[PDB]
């Protein structure tokens, strides 16, 4: 089948912002190309069809342009409602394939998260499981590491993370992590903390407890 | 107008066959090919099944030729999607489109294809520690299937809530959710989550205490 990839995988955009995003396919596909738009919770919307034909209804900002192999999809001056994933589609040569899609996010300030640790619940621990759960909420951007130390040493395994879509009112996004142990592991040690890090070498947001109160 | 609404999704297990319903009105049902595409929980989209106007031809990809037959009832408005031999990478939801989907898509119906078995969650309440606004937590852990909705008081506490995409744990779901208020509420007024799931038909309140 025809193997189409598109670029970039994701990327951020302010309001007014001309984007551009591509789409590739394995061999030439005569310009039978399609664009689609979804947004969360949706299905997706034909935009573009042909390569460069805009469905009845769509604002004059989408335009479409390619050929063979190499195509493209234009909005002139971004709007707010133009933020979701973006597919393209051949269909020429049956069965018809969708490139990966590029999700189109909102662009705002750099933002460090609001963390929260939380201990292990009594009623978790009486089941013999200890959960310790770290929130990091209202960042941006989305890209950063969470780091956990166990009495000053750094614990990767049983770590599960967890990342919410772009919130839609202050283009912000927000993560749980959570450290999975028994609870005899959990009650070996003493001090947990939480570590937020965007880039390197800055000081991180940090949150601590000690099991022993 | 057009109006595409599918139906028939849910859990099957692996091995399992089902078949899908998609009723249309407001055009000619007759007269147009019709077709399912899938949305994989990767998001990634893909060609399901076309057939023609008269439902005598079938197209399919390798993918599922073979396991899944699309069929029509034109007296009845009404095209099918019969699957077997369910394959766990048939997890998707499944969207019927009018011809190539240049106009009309359904909203989709979700088929989910595990042998995990259905279990109602445990919910935790996360208190902070025991040492201006003050964040609480509810950890809904090892439930199964897809969804669950989670609310604050009943919904009346709605901003500064973030409820977290659920993460594979075991063969099960967990997830956890975050509510922010005024540090001057909490623990005066009560804060209780609410975790509804509606595959094991329960509904479960837990109170958020502070720690001893
Ligand atoms: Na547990
Ligand atoms: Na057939
Ligand atoms: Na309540
Ligand atoms: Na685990």
């Known amino acids: 089948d025809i193997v189409m990839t598109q670029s970039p995988s994701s990327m951020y955009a302010s309001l007014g912002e001309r984007v551009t995003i591509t789409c590739k396919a394995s061999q030439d596909i005569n310009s039978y190309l399609s664009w689609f738009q979804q947004k969360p919770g949706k299905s997706p919307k034909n935009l573009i069809y042909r390569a460069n034909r805009l469905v009845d209804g769509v604002p004059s900002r989408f335009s479409g342009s390619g050929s063979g192999q190499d195509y493209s999809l234009t909005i002139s001056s971004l709007e707010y409602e133009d933020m979701g994933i973006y597919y393209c589609l051949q269909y020429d040569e049956f069965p018809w394939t969708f490139g990966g899609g590029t999700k189109l996010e909102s662009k705002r300030a750099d933002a460090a998260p609001t963390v929260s640790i939380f201990p292990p619940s009594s009623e978790q621990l009486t089941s013999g499981g200890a959960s310790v759960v770290c929130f990091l909420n209202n960042f941006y951007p989305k890209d950063i590491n969470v780091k956990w130390k166990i009495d000053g040493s750094e614990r990767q395994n049983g770590v599960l993370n967890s990342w919410t879509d772009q919130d839609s009112k202050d283009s912000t996004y927000s993560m749980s992590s959570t450290l999975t142990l028994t609870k005899d592991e959990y009650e070996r040690h003493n001090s947990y903390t939480c570590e937020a890090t965007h880039k390197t070498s800055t000081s991180p947001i940090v949150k601590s407890f000690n099991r022993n109160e | 107008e057009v109006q595409l609404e599918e139906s028939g999704g849910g859990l099957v297990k692996p091995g399992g066959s089902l078949k899908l319903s998609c009723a249309a009105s407001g055009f000619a049902f007759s007269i147009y090919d019709m077709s399912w595409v899938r949305q994989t929980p990767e998001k990634r989209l893909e060609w399901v099944a076309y057939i023609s106007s008269g439902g005598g031809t079938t197209y399919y990809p390798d993918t599922v030729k073979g396991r899944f037959t699309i069929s029509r009832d034109n007296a009845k408005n009404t095209l099918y999607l019969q699957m077997s031999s369910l394959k766990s990478e048939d997890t998707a939801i499944y969207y019927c489109?009018?011809?190539?989907?240049?106009?009309?898509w359904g909203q989709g119906t979700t088929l989910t294809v595990s042998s995990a078995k259905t279990t109602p969650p445990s919910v935790y309440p996360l208190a902070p520690g025991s040492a201006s606004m003050v964040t609480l937590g509810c950890l809904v852990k090892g439930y199964f299937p897809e969804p669950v909705t989670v609310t604050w008081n009943s919904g009346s506490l709605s901003s500064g809530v973030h409820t977290f995409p659920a993460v594979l744990q075991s063969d099960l779901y967990t997830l956890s959710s975050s509510v922010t208020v005024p540090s001057s509420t909490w623990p005066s007024e009560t804060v209780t989550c609410n975790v509804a799931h509606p595959a094991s038909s329960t509904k479960v309140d837990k109170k958020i205490v502070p720690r001893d």
């Open positions: 489109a009018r011809h190539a989907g240049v106009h009309y």
